[PDB]
């Protein structure tokens, strides 16, 4: 009938509408984890002081 | 397919992002991006997933497979996204939005709650990450640079001059200088933190280089930290050296005919692993490959139909 | 820079010379209880800052509260702001900024 | 100001009917003054030719000629008045129903 | 001739007409301003209720939007040429960032020469003497409302 | 076709002869204007000269459009000779009004030596004490390319037009939008 | 600037100026406006006494009425500042006597320019100040019924 066609028509796009992952921004954070914030997002990877030279090998195979 | 040592991607007003290669001018893949325009795109450190952000959503695309759809998408913000970035280990993603909020997104599908929100009084344009992944730079349209430290919750506010909006800011990987440009073309350079131990985040004004009489669009360093390329609205790009900040090489795309009258601006630039060849994306519906010594271009890519205002170019670490 | 700018200088001098005369009529306008409802989008706290803004614009202490600007400098700043491309592009399409 | 407008054709009127318009105002200028009473005999013989030449497109010129033409007959005296009535009888034979 | 308005609050318009009356008096007794013939045109405003009114009809005046529209259509020029160019270069004009909109906006004003109003005022002048007189009045009458409007804070001047 | 005899006389030296030439030219145009409306007024033109002066513009445009390029070209050089021959205000005023009438027309201004002869008409109306027309022509020259001579000329015209503030704006244009240390002290 | 000591000093100068040369518009107006500026300074001070604003409000009302009768054509500012004190400080008995004599003294054909302001505050909930408005409005109708 009329709505019968629409019911199966709506299912057609439902198969292709589940191929995307959506992540919403919830208003939550580690507000009370003030002390724990020193390592959650404060790793502070102070390293790579020694430098390394290059031989232009990145573009050696490109051209 | 992103299973190559070097990949190149361009996007703009054409609603489609083209994937290119430096070896030849053929287009490997065409991905679709509807009802939005790409502001800036960057690839994850794992080199298996790319991020495109524009107008309240950050669509994520796959590289290993051939999927022209945004498999992963983010929502929640109400304005445009100025720029995106990732941690060196790919733990968290920091995004700068036009809604005056600089926030950090978490890549783990669990209740880690590693997200932090920073609020400023003016919309921001550029977001930069310190090479030690402990500090962060926020620049708004009021000309005030906010140095945000991840260890603490307080950020120092530095403004060289008001009434002028800044567009870009970058830090060299070798952590030697710290440059930024504003809406008048002045490129301010400050010496970065020397306190590697406790992150004393001290800054001093090193030099000012008067150039780019028109608008300044983007400034970026090089992996070897010996070159500094600044984009401009006068269809010219100037490469600066780190020894005495002199003009190393001047690049221009002007045709020399008065009948064109600024046919297209020059938006973005990127360096290679060896800092020898640079990739530039102008608003003339095409992108060019340049060389820092001969000046003359190397290759040209013209697969786009509209202007392109963003490009991503990364290769192997060794070079 | 000819007839337009010179005329603007003349008008601004008159208004600043008669600041009280034009301030009294505006005060009777804003402080009207049955007429300030459309501008209300304490109760009269917003009406205070509106009068303060008008008084600043009649003394030159509008762009920067630190210093006082004379008429030729105040007019010059207004002209730059009104014709700047950054401000014009943000306007509504129906406003016809390009016209 | 309307007379000055027609001399320069501010309305961008096509030249097909611009010439009768500019000719009409020139004739009426020397027709509203009693000083040029000697020229009133022959100016009317030229006005009646314009209406005859045009036909149905002379209606818009009626609000200009008629108020002055009727006034002249009232003030003029002599053998001119008997001549003007015959000319006035020819104008009403060209424009038929618009003399209301 | 009047203009019977409905669903509009005209009490505010009555109060700004009184303000302009004060400004005319201030410019009238100024020797340097009276000689230049500076004044602000006003129209009668008679409110009838909280949402109705009666605005006087000012003769011999036409809006700027209709004035330009007639000139462009006579010259076989599309009314929205500038708008079409911006959409052609970037269809998502409303979603562009602040810096990107400047590039599109600046490109449109460079490819089209804006002189429609300049030529319009001359083609409607019977002679050159009248043309110069009207242009002088236009320049020094727009300046008065720009400064007075700035103090009053007028907006939405489309 | 017979206008060449009326135009190309070259025997006019006295002021009265120029006046006689003008009325002969005006009378000739009404005689053959390719329009019965204008021909009917030819009889009154002989018996009344002032009614033929205001009809000069209407009569001229009627015949000028009919003529081809070769015939109308001879008229243009005759007008140029008439303008650069005498200094009578009355004769120049009639020709000055003819130029303005053509500009308002949709067919464009009549061709002349250089860009419809704006330079020639601009300096011709200066001595006729008609500065409203002179200012208009000077602005047209400025729109093509600004020169120090034009900027100096604009200051002089506005000063004698009782617009001291308008002339002041011209100076500020050269202060910032022109080379420095170039403004003449005069 | 206007301080707790500057204001008493300048009032002495303005008061002496009025008596030396009366019938001067710039003399009465300057003294009257200063008193109006004096009460505002004290009003902001105590919000962050009834008998502390009384010595300034009464002379201010009397000063404005003198200036109104002295301008006769360009007194829009003067006739408007009276309403500000009348509608805000007119509920005290001491102010009523100064207002009632001023209205009778000045010409009736001066309140026409301020008709919209008077109609706005007809519904004031203070009977002492509310009824005073009605008398002059009726008087305006007596002489100019077609304007109100």
UniProtKB/Swiss-Prot annotation, chain A:
Subcellular location: Cell membrane; Endoplasmic reticulum membrane; Early endosome membrane; Late endosome membrane
Protein's name according to its UniProt entry: Target of rapamycin complex 2 subunit MAPKAP1
Source species taxonomy: Eukaryota, Metazoa, Chordata, Craniata, Vertebrata
Whole sequence portion shown: 84 to 146 of 522
Modified residues (Phosphoserine): 45
Similarity field: Belongs to the SIN1 family.
Complex and partners: Component of the mechanistic target of rapamycin complex 2 (mTORC2), consisting in two heterotretramers composed of MTOR, MLST8, RICTOR and MAPKAP1/SIN1. The mTORC2 core complex associates with PRR5/PROTOR1 and/or PRR5L/PROTOR2. Contrary to mTORC1, mTORC2 does not bind to and is not sensitive to FKBP12-rapamycin. Interacts with MAP3K2. Interacts with ATF2. Interacts with MAPK8. Interacts with GTP-bound HRAS and KRAS; inhibiting their activity. Interacts with IFNAR2.
Entry note about domains: The CRIM domain forms a ubiquitin-like fold with a characteristic acidic loop, which recognizes and binds AGC protein kinase family members substrates. The SIN1-type PH binds phosphatidylinositol 3,4,5-trisphosphate (PI(3,4,5)P3). It plays a dual role in mTORC2: in absence of PI(3,4,5)P3, it binds and inactivates MTOR. PI(3,4,5)P3-binding relieves the inhibition, leading to mTORC2 activation.
Tissues where this protein is expressed: Ubiquitously expressed, with highest levels in heart and skeletal muscle.
Curated annotation (Swiss-Prot), chain C:
Top-level taxonomy: Eukaryota, Metazoa, Chordata, Craniata, Vertebrata
Protein name in UniProt: Serine/threonine-protein kinase mTOR
The FATC domain, residue ranges: 67-99
Assembly: Part of the mechanistic target of rapamycin complex 1 (mTORC1) which contains MTOR, MLST8 and RPTOR. The mTORC1 complex is a 1 Md obligate dimer of two stoichiometric heterotetramers with overall dimensions of 290 A x 210 A x 135 A. It has a rhomboid shape and a central cavity, the dimeric interfaces are formed by interlocking interactions between the two MTOR and the two RPTOR subunits.
Documented effect of changing residue 35 to P: In FCORD2; somatic mutation; increased TOR signaling; increased kinase activity
Domain remarks: The kinase domain (PI3K/PI4K) is intrinsically active but has a highly restricted catalytic center.
Impact when changing residue 35 to Q: In FCORD2; somatic mutation; increased TOR signaling; increased kinase activity
Organism: Homo sapiens (Human)
Tissue and organ expression note: Expressed in numerous tissues, with highest levels in testis.
UniProt disease link: Smith-Kingsmore syndrome: An autosomal dominant syndrome characterized by intellectual disability, macrocephaly, seizures, umbilical hernia, and facial dysmorphic features.
Record PTM text: Autophosphorylates when part of mTORC1 or mTORC2. Phosphorylation in the kinase domain modulates the interactions of MTOR with RPTOR and AKT1S1/PRAS40 and leads to increased intrinsic mTORC1 kinase activity.
Stated family: Belongs to the PI3/PI4-kinase family.
Swiss-Prot record, chain E:
Tissues in which the UniProt entry reports expression: Expressed in numerous tissues, with highest levels in testis.
Region (Interaction with MLST8): 76-114
Listed result of changing residue 33 to Y: In FCORD2; also found in a colorectal adenocarcinoma sample; somatic mutation; increased TOR signaling
Region (Catalytic loop): 153-158
Family designation: Belongs to the PI3/PI4-kinase family.
Domain comment, as recorded: The kinase domain (PI3K/PI4K) is intrinsically active but has a highly restricted catalytic center. The FAT domain forms three discontinuous subdomains of alpha-helical TPR repeats plus a single subdomain of HEAT repeats. The four domains pack sequentially to form a C-shaped a-solenoid that clamps onto the kinase domain.
Disease implication from the record: Smith-Kingsmore syndrome: An autosomal dominant syndrome characterized by intellectual disability, macrocephaly, seizures, umbilical hernia, and facial dysmorphic features.
Protein name: Serine/threonine-protein kinase mTOR
Organism (species): Homo sapiens (Human)
Originating gene: MTOR
Curated annotation (Swiss-Prot), chain G:
UniProt-reported outcome of changing residue 37 to K: In SKS; results in increased mTOR signaling
Subcellular locations according to the entry: Lysosome membrane; Endoplasmic reticulum membrane; Golgi apparatus membrane; Cell membrane
UniProt TPR repeat ranges: 74-106, 107-146
Family per similarity comment: Belongs to the PI3/PI4-kinase family.
Function description: Serine/threonine protein kinase which is a central regulator of cellular metabolism, growth and survival in response to hormones, growth factors, nutrients, energy and stress signals. MTOR directly or indirectly regulates the phosphorylation of at least 800 proteins. Functions as part of 2 structurally and functionally distinct signaling complexes mTORC1 and mTORC2 (mTOR complex 1 and 2).
Known disease link: Smith-Kingsmore syndrome: An autosomal dominant syndrome characterized by intellectual disability, macrocephaly, seizures, umbilical hernia, and facial dysmorphic features.
Protein name: Serine/threonine-protein kinase mTOR
Organism name: Homo sapiens (Human)
